[PDB]
Amino acid sequence: MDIDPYKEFGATVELLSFLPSDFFPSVRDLLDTASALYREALESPEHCSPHHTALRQAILCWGELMTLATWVGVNLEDPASRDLVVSYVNTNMGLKFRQLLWFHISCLTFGRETVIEYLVSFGVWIRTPPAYRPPNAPILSTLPETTVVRRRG
Amino acid sequence: MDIDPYKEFGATVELLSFLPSDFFPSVRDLLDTASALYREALESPEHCSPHHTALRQAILCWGELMTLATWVGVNLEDPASRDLVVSYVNTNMGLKFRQLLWFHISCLTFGRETVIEYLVSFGVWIRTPPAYRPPNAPILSTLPET
Amino acid sequence: MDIDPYKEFGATVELLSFLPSDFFPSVRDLLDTASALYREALESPEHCSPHHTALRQAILCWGELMTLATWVGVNLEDPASRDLVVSYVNTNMGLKFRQLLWFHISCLTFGRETVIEYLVSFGVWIRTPPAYRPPNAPILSTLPETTVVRRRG
Amino acid sequence: MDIDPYKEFGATVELLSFLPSDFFPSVRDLLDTASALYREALESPEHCSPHHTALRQAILCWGELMTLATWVGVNLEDPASRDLVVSYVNTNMGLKFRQLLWFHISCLTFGRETVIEYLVSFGVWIRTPPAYRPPNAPILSTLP
Amino acid sequence: MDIDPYKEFGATVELLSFLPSDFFPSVRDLLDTASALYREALESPEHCSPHHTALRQAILCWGELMTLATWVGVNLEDPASRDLVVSYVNTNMGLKFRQLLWFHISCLTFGRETVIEYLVSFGVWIRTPPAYRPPNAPILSTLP
Amino acid sequence: MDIDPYKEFGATVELLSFLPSDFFPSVRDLLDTASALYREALESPEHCSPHHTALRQAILCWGELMTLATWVGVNLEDPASRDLVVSYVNTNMGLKFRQLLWFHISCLTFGRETVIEYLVSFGVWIRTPPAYRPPNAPILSTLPET
Fold it and tell me: Which of C121, D107, D133, F18 has the most C-beta neighbours closer than 10 Å?
């Protein structure tokens, strides 16, 4: 069974592979962002969108994993094995979770098509050799770098 | 965050717990059923249903867990711990997976409302003493009654 | 009870927690700004806005804190203890005060939705690792080019 | 900045001065009453009223005060100072908290007009010389 | 199952906590009042009100409790245990029964809105420090 | 009586204090600017503006203070006191004069509302940490943007 988590969203694992593995934020930062913005929609009984469904299942899965980590911590007869297992989950499996969280959380705030155009643009930027690479890398945002606001009444 | 996977589908973890743990098929039987019925849909480029989205994520997750199991098998020199961890994955997480696979696969085969009614009515049938219930265990079926 | 100061205003502690401690002005600077812009409204008997009320509350709380600080400085007869307490109040409770003063003062000047959007984008920026982060942070300012010309008709 | 806590709500510090300091209920009791009647409203994202906002502000700051008190209780190596500081926060910063908690919690239950009317009458009563002061001090109630 | 006895009737266990345990009247007196005023309604086949149903449930269960107490009084061959068990049922299961009997019997006589309004006011009174607490505690009455 | 010179002009002593004392130009620069731009108007027979009236009174007052300074210089035999008094006039009263001259001269050059907005926005810019503000100090200007 060759499922790609992104195929139904029109992305691919190769397109996100355009991003380097150290690009993605920490798990803590992504979970904090998700809790702050979409905790009330994610916990709702509505099929708000496929992004919410995916994000929900993934959070439950990461939870079952952290539970496994705590279980290994309390029920093992070896510190080395205990460390080896905890590291694999918080490192190898973590990178995968960080990538999915970023895509969905970014597709829900910025919008899917914005994320695909971002991925293409960043791919072009990072492929460029550093000698000719401009300093300002592409970034997802709504507002201009410097915002002009004045209020009157 | 506090989430039930079933809340968007109108079910609850309590309702799935209502049926006994022995009821749900093996992971092998559920994965073979899901592949045979729905492989082409799950691999499709489109959100055929939220049931498909959930199933996709879950299958990817079980794949990752089995990869972890193989990794422990090959890297963990300690066999006592090796067995302990491999067993936890295929017992606890195995039963969490079996329940979800059964629900989604069954909701696609027989329809969600049918599965919810089946969960309620089978749970009450198991609770009922055998002298005062219909003699056969309730089963989902797709054949016409004639 | 569990109360979030910004929940009523459409923001969360998580959303504001991304701002670094270097970002907020000093207590003096914020109290000067609040008094200069909004003193006559804050002293007013009408409730101009909930933010105005929140600012009054925070100001009174900081005043009571500085009062207890002077008390210890004149009451506590230990030079070591005197310092520990005075420092905790100007540093820990000081940074908490600076964060709230900035939010309300800025929500009064720019507008609440503007401030929340700024927070979201600045968060996206501070979460980007420095190797990929654009070198200048997003800015919320009332000046487009720090040059004031006579207004058009 | 000459901010008055009650000026926006139509009262003054002088008017509250009419009540004696001892009259105000203990912090624990006031907090329990607030939790019992308004916990859901206080934690809600809507601005129910200005008084609700003021009560939240008072709560979160008293919380910060108890946090600093806990900080001196775990860090200060002097039992003399440790005691002095904690005593100024539970007695001196607590009598101000008690006053504000009473005004807002009472304006939410009875109504602010009623609360301010009760401040004038209690004043008249405490001013009455004991030979003529009636044994029943004024009390707030919602009885029909 | 986190069932709250008074939640359906618009009250909470926290709100009833405001009254002291000693305040509630004795079981015998409450049962006599219920019999005197509502015996016919309670025994009727119609559902007069939800409160009437709750009162019937409370009565029939207290009856079962006294039945089990009678059972330990006639079967247990130990006077030590016989006493202990019976004492937990008349004191510990009796204070809960007294609370429910009071709420429902009082909601039937006064009205539930009135009963809940009396719970807030008694709270205000018991919170008042004794130096200012008036000698007349709040009381329910039907006087016009 | 309690008067702010700025109250009739919609400003306050607090708002002028908001800008740092170092900001305002010297008395020489302000008097030269006022003479060059507005001498003919200030000397005119008419109330061109309340800004002109205020400026007129203030200039006459500074003239009187400078006369007092010269008088002390020539009559006061004591040099310690002579220096002490001359310094007080050109430091304290000097900064009170510099602030008022800047406000009125600037209100005539750029318009009152522009000057009030500049006072607010420059004060907030000085308060803002340098990493999170526009890099240049706000300046009043009369040139078109093109």
Answer: D107
Q: Which residues contact B95 (CB under 8 A, 6 or more apart)?
A: B21, B24
In order, the DSSP letters of chain B are ----TTGGGT--HHHHHHS-TTTSPPHHHHHHHHHHHHHHHHTSSS---HHHHHHHHHHHHHHHHHHHHHHHHHH---HHHHHHHHHHIIIIIHHHHHHHHHHHHHHHHH-HHHHHHHHHHHHHHHHS-GGGS-SSPP----S---
- Chain B contacts of A3, Cβ < 8 Å? 42-43, 56, 59-60, 63
C92 and C33 Cβ atoms separated by less than 8 Å: no
Chain B CB within 8 Å of residue A40 CB: no
Cα distance between residue B107 and residue B11, in whole Å: 11
Question: How many CB atoms neighbour CB C96 within 10 A?
Answer: 19
| A52-A55-A60-A61 Cα dihedral, nearest 10 degrees | 150
**Shortest CA distance to A99 belongs to which of A3, A16, A4?**
A16
Dihedral sign of CA atoms F108, F114, F119, F122 in order:
negative
Contact A139 C129 (CB under 8 A): no
CA distance A139 to A121: 9
C-alpha torsion sign, points A17, A20, A23, A25? positive
CB contact under 8 A, A109 and C132: no
- d(CA B7, CA A43) in angstroms, rounded, equals 8
Phi, psi angle pair for A148, to nearest 5°: -105, 120
CA-CA distance, A144 to C79, in Å (whole number)?
A: 51
- Which secondary-structure segment (H or E) carries E43? helix E27-43
Q: Which chains have at least 3 CB atom pairs separated by less than 8 Å from chain A?
A: B, C
Are the C-beta atoms of residues B16 and B104 closer than 8 Å to each other? no
Question: How many angstroms separate the CA atoms of C35 and C44, rounded?
Answer: 13
- Which sign, positive or negative, has the C-alpha torsion F21, F24, F29, F34? negative
Count CB atoms within 10 A of the CB of residue C130: 7
DSSP codes, chain A: ----TTGGGT--HHHHHTS-TTSSPPHHHHHHHHHHHHHHHHTSSS---HHHHHHHHHHHHHHHHHHHHHHHHHS-S-HHHHHHHHHHIIIIIHHHHHHHHHHHHHHHHT-HHHHHHHHHHHHHHHHS-TTT--SS-----SS-SEEE-----
Distance of residue F9 Cα from the nearest chain C Cα, in angstroms: 16
Q: Which residue among B5, B89, B93 sits closest to A56, beta carbon to beta carbon?
A: B5
Contact between A139 and C117 using a beta-carbon 8 Å cutoff? no
Dihedral of CA D128/D132/D137/D142: which sign? negative
What is the C-alpha separation between A20 and D95, in angstroms, rounded? 58
In A, which residues are within 8 Å of C117 by CB distance?
142-143
At residue B56, what is the residue type? R
Which chain D residue shows the shortest CA-CA distance from C62?
Answer: D61
Instruction: Please give the C-alpha separations between residue F18 and each of F10, F99, F118, in angstroms, as whole numbers.
Output: 15, 11, 11
How many residues in total does chain D contain?
A: 144
Distance CA B107, CA B15 (A): 14
Q: What is the resolution of this structure in A?
A: 2.7
CB atoms within 10 A of CB E95: 13
Report the C-alpha gap between C108 and D77 in whole angstroms.
44
In sequence order, the β-bridge partners of residue C139 are: A146
Closest CA to B9 of B43, B46, B58: B58
DSSP readout, E50-79?
A: HHHHHHHHHHHHHHHHHHHHHHHHHH---H
Beta partners for residue F140, in sequence order: C148
Q: How far is CA C5 from CA C65, D61, F10, in A?
A: 18, 10, 35
C37, two tokens: 């812009």
Interface contact E120-D109, CB threshold 8 A: yes
Any idea what the Cα angle at residue C123 is, between residues C122 and C124, rounded to 5°? 90
